[PDB]
Design a protein around this ligand. Structure first.
Ligand SMILES: Nc1nc2c(ncn2[C@@H]2O[C@H](COP(=O)(O)OP(=O)(O)OP(=O)(O)O)[C@@H](O)[C@H]2O)c(=O)[nH]1
Ligand SMILES: Nc1nc2c(ncn2[C@@H]2O[C@H](COP(=O)(O)OP(=O)(O)O)[C@@H](O)[C@H]2O)c(=O)[nH]1
Ligand SMILES: [Mg+2]
Lengths: 432, 431, 154
């Protein structure tokens, strides 16, 4: 019946307020939490209460927590347009950040704040009749995004066992890249979180930067441009959980349908249409575009891999017959290779609520949209890119002294890489 | 990671240190009485890094002014921004080191050091979250070198969790005709290799060459050299002073720039290089700025970048310019020069664009490089030292001031080791 | 008034998202003319149209909707059943007390809860009598709802 959202570090926090901006707009909630009869969504039945608690006033408060080891990013939330929406105890900040060092976010600095964060989550969990689990937002490359998330994921497994933990991860890019050591932090977080996450949706900063330049025509896309797009995709993924829809309703339906092997839990999300506000696309067109590598959240070639799962989540002006017709052409016309032991079944969901766009945002308002979730072998390409970068620096032990001096053992680097090697072999072997 | 505590030691330290304050105070919109008289909101956003908000609307530099020569005290206070410094923060002796390292590190300097540590303790307390320390000094003298490195060691032992960064000016026969300078420089480099996290190598040989060969300054003064230093210190600390992502704090910059703890000596650079008051002419483009970043003639340390490989590079562009232009020009410079960049350090060249340009310039570029070619700088000092130390010439001036000959041998060993280390990574392949 | 005729003809329309959007609209405005067409949409082919017609009929309140909503508590779709139960709770007609009590033994948690909430909203005297009888001769969840109602009512 309820989900808690945890936003860790700069990326996670900044994405969280872009997500929450869209959630409010989608469910007809004002920045103060009020949902008045003029702004109420209309068509009765609403399951947004999985993400928003209701105060005695009639104020809808996000079941969200924002954590950063420095105050800069959350101060913007506290002074922003949504200052009124969240309660002060939900927004947690330190003084000294993790300085793009995993060991600071996991050990030294992270250990100082872990206990408070847990009590702040406990305040939210205590307001849930039947808490399903957590949605964790963070970067791979920041010291807090990598280090503190893995430390928190570890502690949430102990403190909340039979509770799902689905991630939204900021995969690094050389374009928006504030650190050299991001490959180290990425391998370290993925190693320690692997046994604690149930599902992980990666967002490759290079893909969104490419999408903004190609589809939205932004010359040099900023964090503002990327985030409006991330939140559009993320909303389409989480829509199942906030709406009275049939496919991927609870966090368990999401795990059951999308993940057949436990370690191999990284679904690749695609989204169409991503149009700049500057021409109407049909169900056939938007379904077809899901199978185009250009429109993917993560850079990878699905024609080089095998699928284990394939879900299509449509929203807006989407007719059942048109969806069936579109799927039928994709089965007969495309070269979509599935693994032997799993059936070639496209799980389809349709929500007739029109797409909600960001006012003042770079995205145009479309009649229909689609978010495809594919569990493909091709995502091992994202791991390989990262693993090679890691190997280059690690062989000469460059920057390692920064980690060993911050409560970490050098062997945890070799142990981490070994887990990545196994993960890469697993994707290879599963795709025969 | 907010506040930065500044310490300036000796003649050079106080001269170059005062020019740094004069320049960044003007940038942050501060007059010599400490009142903010600017227009941009961005000028005061990260003001708490280098200034304390003493009293009302007034700003104070978090600066500690040290020298064993008391003459320096009046020079600073009678200067342009002399009235903004805390009167209690001036710690001055009545003697002088007479360009003896042993006099600043053990005798006269060690007497005054505790009084300085009292002042640094005072400033560290009115600090919400101290980032670290920044020392402005000369390696060629006695005070800045000996007392300055005693201070570094004393601060390192007191504040070990804090970053220790320096702006060390390298001696040159072209600038100073003092004979024992290689001893003072070698003995200081030995301290810096162990007790600093980041050292900006400001070579007086490169400063002279830029003025003589390019600026056409017939016989430059220290005022001409210090114009290059103040402009460099202004550009290298830009990230720390204005709101930004890349290398915002001392630790975040240290993480990106330092792969190995001993290889923390940076070759700074600036573009455009304008002579002191030479009427602003010809507006540079992003490609002209990017080209002047790599150009050996624009380096503040006397080393050819083409004689080594870059381990890490931090580029800072200032002013109103296209982000597409900077991204385009920094990508070409790396591909069309792949051979001069270490292959085993992915994405080692980090770019930054700050919309506030420096005084008198509509656009500028600052370069911070961790190039293996900086071994040329240390080799020059070692050669200079060896000629003298072989004969054990003028060693009595140091050993008489409570120093040992093994200290000279240890300094020489460490500096030769550092050069060998730079060579190993220059020859290192990804394979 | 001028737009009420439009959405009533969109409720008939071929396109399922258009039929859904017509039912969402007639609940947002809520005119007495929309009662009988929304009653027909309770028997729609699509569950997303049926559940929002049910939510619309509960908001408007018209007594003519009480009978089709009673039959809607037996709809194959869990969301349609929950929305029909809640609609009957909004209307508050005592004819719904016994069909809502039968919904207390539904396989879906939301439907059971929605039936419990609806009964509490009607809270007449026939509800009370049925709660008294269920508190003594009742089992599990259905017994808890009878016992909770009589303790929330001194
Ligand atoms: N798309 C996106 N990426 C971001 C954003 N902010 C930072 N990043 C990326 O995330 C990585 C840096 O990690 P951060 O999230 O900033 O770091 P952090 O979690 O705050 O940790 P510390 O820096 O150690 O305090 C780089 O890949 C950045 O480009 C954002 O709002 N959106
Ligand atoms: N660029 C520059 N170098 C200086 C300045 N003053 C002294 N030096 C150099 O610093 C060295 C001497 O150090 P100095 O500061 O005079 O000695 P101290 O007072 O004992 O620290 C020589 O190599 C000088 O060339 C100055 O203002 N600018
Ligand atoms: Mg941060």
């Amino acid at each position: 019946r309820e989900c808690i959202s945890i936003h860790v570090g700069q990326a996670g926090v900044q994405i969280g307020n872009a997500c929450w901006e869209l959630y409010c707009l989608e469910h007809g909630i004002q920045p103060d939490g009020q949902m008045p009869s003029d702004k109420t969504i209309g068509g009765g039945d609403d399951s947004f209460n999985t993400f928003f608690s209701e105060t005695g006033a009639g104020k809808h408060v996000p079941r969200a927590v924002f954590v950063d080891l420095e105050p800069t990013v959350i101060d913007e939330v506290r002074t922003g347009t949504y200052r009124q929406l969240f309660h002060p105890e939900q927004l947690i900040t330190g003084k000294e950040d993790a300085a793009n060092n995993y060991a600071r976010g996991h050990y030294t600095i992270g250990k100082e704040i872990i206990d408070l964060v847990l009590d702040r989550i406990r305040k939210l969990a205590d307001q849930c009749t039947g808490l399903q689990g957590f949605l964790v937002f963070h970067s791979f490359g920041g010291g807090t995004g990598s280090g503190f998330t893995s430390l928190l994921m570890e502690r949430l497994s102990v403190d909340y066992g039979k509770k799902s933990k689905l991630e939204f991860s900021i995969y690094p890019a050389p374009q928006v890249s504030t650190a050299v050591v991001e490959p180290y932090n990425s391998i370290l977080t993925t190693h320690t979180t692997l046994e604690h996450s149930d599902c992980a949706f990666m967002v490759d900063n290079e893909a969104i930067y490419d999408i903004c330049r190609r589809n939205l025509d932004i010359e040099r896309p900023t964090y503002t441009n990327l985030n409006r797009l991330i939140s559009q995709i993320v909303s389409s993924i989480t829509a199942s959980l906030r709406f009275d829809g049939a496919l991927n309703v609870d966090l368990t339906e999401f795990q059951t349908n999308l993940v057949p092997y436990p370690r191999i839990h990284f679904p690749l999300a695609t989204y169409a249409p991503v149009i700049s506000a500057e021409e109407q696309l049909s169900v056939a067109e938007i379904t077809n575009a899901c199978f185009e590598p250009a429109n993917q959240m993560v850079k990878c070639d699905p024609r080089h891999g095998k699928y284990m799962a394939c879900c299509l989540l449509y929203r807006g002006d989407v007719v059942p017959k048109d969806v069936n017709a579109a799927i039928a052409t994709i089965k007969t016309k495309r070269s979509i290779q599935f693994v032997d032991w799993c059936p070639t079944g496209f799980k389809v969901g349709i929500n007739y609520q029109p797409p909600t766009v960001v006012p003042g945002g770079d995205l145009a308002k479309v009649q229909r949209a689609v978010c495809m979730l594919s569990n493909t072998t091709a995502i091992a390409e994202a791991w390989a890119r990262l693993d090679h970068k890691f190997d280059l620096m690690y062989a000469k032990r460059a920057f390692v002294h920064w980690y060993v001096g911050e409560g970490m053992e050098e062997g945890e680097f070799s142990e981490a890489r070994e887990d990545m090697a196994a993960l890469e072999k697993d994707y290879e072997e599963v795709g025969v | 990671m907010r506040e930065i505590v500044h310490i300036q030691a000796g003649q050079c330290g106080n001269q170059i240190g005062a020019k740094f304050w004069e320049v960044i105070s003007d940038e942050h919109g501060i007059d010599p009485t400490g009142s903010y008289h600017g227009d941009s909101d961005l000028q005061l956003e990260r003001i708490n890094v280098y200034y304390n908000e003493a009293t009302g609307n007034k700003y104070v530099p978090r600066a500690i002014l040290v020298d064993l020569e008391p003459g320096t005290m009046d020079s600073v206070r009678s200067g342009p921004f002399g009235q903004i410094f805390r009167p209690d923060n001036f710690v001055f002796g009545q003697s002088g080191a007479g360009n003896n390292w042993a006099k600043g590190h053990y005798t006269e300097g060690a007497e005054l050091v505790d009084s300085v540590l009292d002042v640094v303790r005072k400033e560290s307390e009115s600090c919400d979250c101290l980032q670290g320390f920044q020392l402005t000094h000369s390696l060629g003298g006695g005070t800045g070198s000996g007392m300055g490195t005693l201070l570094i060691s004393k601060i390192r032992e007191e504040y070990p969790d804090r970053i220790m960064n320096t702006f060390s000016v390298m001696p040159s026969p072209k600038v100073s005709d003092t004979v024992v300078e290689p001893y003072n420089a070698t003995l200081s480099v030995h301290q810096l290799v162990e007790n600093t996290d980041e050292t900006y190598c400001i070579d007086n040989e490169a400063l002279y060459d830029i003025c003589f060969r390019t600026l056409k300054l017939t016989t430059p003064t220290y005022g001409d050299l210090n114009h290059l230093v103040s402009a460099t210190m202004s550009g290298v600390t830009t990230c720390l002073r204005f709101p930004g992502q890349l290398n915002a704090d001392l630790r975040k910059l240290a993480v990106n720039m330092v792969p190995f703890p001993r290889l923390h000596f940076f070759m700074p650079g600036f573009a455009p290089l304008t002579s002191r008051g030479s009427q602003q002419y010809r507006a540079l483009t992003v490609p002209e700025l990017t080209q002047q970043m790599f150009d050996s003639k624009n380096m503040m340390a006397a080393c050819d970048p083409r004689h080594g490989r870059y381990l890490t590079v931090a580029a800072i562009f200032r002013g109103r310019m296209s982000m597409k232009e900077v991204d385009e020009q920094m990508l070409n410079v790396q591909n069309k020069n792949s051979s001069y960049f270490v292959e085993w350090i992915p994405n080692n060249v980090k770019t930054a664009v700050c919309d506030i340009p420096p005084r008198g310039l509509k656009m500028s570029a600052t370069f911070i490089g961790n190039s293996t070619a900086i071994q040329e700088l240390f080799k020059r000092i070692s050669e200079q030292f060896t000629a003298m130390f072989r004969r054990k010439a003028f060693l009595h001036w140091y050993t008489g001031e409570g120093m040992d000959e093994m200290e000279f041998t240890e300094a020489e060993s460490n500096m030769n080791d550092l050069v060998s280390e730079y060579q190993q990574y220059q020859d290192a392949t990804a394979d | 008034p001028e737009k009420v005729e439009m959405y009533i003809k969109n409720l008939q329309d071929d396109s399922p998202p258009v039929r859904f959007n017509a039912a969402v609209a007639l609940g947002k405005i809520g005119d007495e003319r929309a009662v009988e067409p929304l009653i027909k949409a309770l028997k729609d082919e699509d569950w997303q149209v049926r559940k929002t017609a049910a939510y619309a009929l509960g908001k408007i309140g018209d007594e003519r909707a009480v009978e089709p909503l009673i039959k809607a508590l037996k709809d194959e779709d869990r969301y349609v059943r929950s929305r029909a139960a809640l609609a009957l709770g909004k209307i508050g007609d005592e004819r719904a007390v016994e069909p809502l009590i039968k919904a207390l033994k539904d396989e879906d948690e939301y439907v059971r809860l929605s039936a419990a909430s609806a009964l509490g909203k009607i809270g007449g005297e026939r509800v009370r009598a049925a709660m008294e009888k269920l508190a003594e001769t009742g089992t599990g969840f259905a017994r808890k709802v009878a016992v909770n109602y009589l303790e929330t009512h001194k």
